[PDB]
């Protein structure tokens, strides 16, 4: 832990500076150091951890998809040698390393200490998300196990959020959006994908009347992402 000698409060302050600077690798490393201090994370600190790693893995997924596409076009075609495959493997190995880093943080020991609905559902969502990114690139004998590790984390998160959070809760809506996409493009379950997004959209719509203007904006922002997916899929 290269961050072990910095103050937790300085690690958090520098993650926010690094967001403002669009330095997401620094942001992630700062938030990694903060988590490794061993204290629970606040709501804001959880968002910083999520935002930081999502931008890092997002750059790697975009890069992976471009190289996977070139590599497929070269397997249809004039042989160019092993360079496309080797580079796509290097990026992929880096991507798997980032997903393993996040999963290790959730397993040591964020999830076992998360007693509140909002914290536990948040981390269980992250676990599903980072198993899903692994599954996007998996081809071997562990692909089925990876998919099931995503499904299992997503399901436990869904069970808690159903019992403990209103249908408009932004973490609950984000979980359902992502779980829906998992059904669609990972689990080959497009009907399940569509059913969960309609049901999520409809139940939140009925709860909107209970909300303040700011909560209303938060929730309706995510309902619009659910509706966009459904428009794309139907």
């Amino acid at each position: 832990g290269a961050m072990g000698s910095m103050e937790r409060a300085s690690l958090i302050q520098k993650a926010k500076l690094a967001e403002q600077a669009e330095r997401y690798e620094d942001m992630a490393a700062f938030m990694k150091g903060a988590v490794e201090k061993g204290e629970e994370l606040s709501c804001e600190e959880r968002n910083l951890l999520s935002v930081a790693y999502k931008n890092v893995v997002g750059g790697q997924r975009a890069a992976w998809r471009v190289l996977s596409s070139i590599e497929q076009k070269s397997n249809e075609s004039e042989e160019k040698g092993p360079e496309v495959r080797e580079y796509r493997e290097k990026v992929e190995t880096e991507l798997q390393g980032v997903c393993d880093t996040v999963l290790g943080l959730l397993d040591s020991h964020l999830i076992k200490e998360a007693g509140d609905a909002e914290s536990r559902v948040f981390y269980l969502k992250m676990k599903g998300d980072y198993y899903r990114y692994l599954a996007e690139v998996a081809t071997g004998d562990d692909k089925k196990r990876i998919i099931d590790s995503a499904r299992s984390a997503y399901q436990e998160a869904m069970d808690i959020s159903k019992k403990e959070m209103p249908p408009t809760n932004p973490i609950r809506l984000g979980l359902a959006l992502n779980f829906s996409v998992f059904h669609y493009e990972i689990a080959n379950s497009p009907e399940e994908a569509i059913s969960l997004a309609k049901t999520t959209f409809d139940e939140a719509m009925a709860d909107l009347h209970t909300l303040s203007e700011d909560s209303y904006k938060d929730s309706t922002l995510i309902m619009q992402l659910l509706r966009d997916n459904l428009t794309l899929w139907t």
Binding site: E22, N55, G58, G59, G174, V181, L225, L232
Partner: peptide
């Protein structure tokens, strides 16, 4: 138009 997941890249 790519399907949405949260959070989104910058």
């Amino acid at each position: 138009p790519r399907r949405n997941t949260l959070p989104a890249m910058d």
